[PDB]
């Protein structure tokens, strides 16, 4: 769904993710063997002259059945170790991060809506 040089939408309230020029950061690397990013995968963002890692929570590309499909590609910023950059999440996010193996309890705790 998301690959290199793909624009994404930042959903958390991180000051870094707020663009005063309405300019969307674009992914520069996907942390997977095939370079394809589905819901819950870790990628890299080149935002405001900084190479900040990010976690993707939603994509426009359709997925499996009974899985919610967003009309926009949503990302949430995290630190180099796993802590989120922003404080809270406003847009609804999938609940599939529980089943997936990885560090998803941090974002889920600060998330608000479930879909």
Partner 1 sequence: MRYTDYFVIVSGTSTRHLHAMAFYVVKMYKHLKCKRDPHVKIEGKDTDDWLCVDFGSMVIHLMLPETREIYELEKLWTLRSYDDQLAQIAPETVPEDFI
Partner RNA sequence: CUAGAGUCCAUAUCAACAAUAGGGCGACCUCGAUGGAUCAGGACAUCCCGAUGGUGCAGCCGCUAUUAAAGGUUCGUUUAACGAUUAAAGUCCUACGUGAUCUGAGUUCAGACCGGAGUAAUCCAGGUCGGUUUCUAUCUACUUAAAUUCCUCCCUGUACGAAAGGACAAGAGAAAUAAGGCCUACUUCACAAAGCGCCUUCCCCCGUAAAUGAUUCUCAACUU
Which of 29, 91, 92, 96 forms a contact with RNA (CB under 7 A)?
29
Q: Hey, what are 44's tokens?
A: 């890299």
Q: Which residue reads 């976690």 in tokens? A: 55
Contacting residues for 51 by C-beta, under 8 A, at least 6 apart: 28, 44, 45
Residue 109 sits in the site that holds partner 1 (CB under 8 A) = yes
Does 35 sit near partner 1 (CB under 8 A)? no
Count of CB atoms within 10 A of residue 88's CB? Answer: 13
**Residues at the site binding partner 1, with contacts judged by CB under 8 A:** 13, 22, 79, 81-83, 87-88, 90, 95, 98, 103-106, 108-110, 112, 114
Residues forming the site for RNA (CB under 7 A): 4, 28-29, 31-35, 44, 51, 62, 64-65, 101
């Amino acid at each position: 769904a998301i690959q290199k040089m793909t624009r994404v939408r930042v959903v958390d309230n991180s000051a870094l993710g707020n663009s005063p020029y309405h300019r969307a950061p674009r992914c520069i690397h996907v942390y997977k063997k095939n370079g394809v990013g589905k819901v819950g995968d870790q990628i890299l963002l080149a935002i405001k002259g900084q190479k900040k890692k990010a976690l993707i929570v939603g994509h426009c590309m359709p997925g499996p059945r009974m899985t919610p499909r967003f009309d926009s590609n949503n990302v949430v910023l995290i630190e180099d170790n796993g802590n989120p950059v922003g404080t809270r999440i406003k847009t609804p996010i999938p609940t599939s991060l529980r089943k997936r193996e990885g560090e998803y309890s941090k974002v889920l705790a600060i998330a608000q809506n479930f879909v």
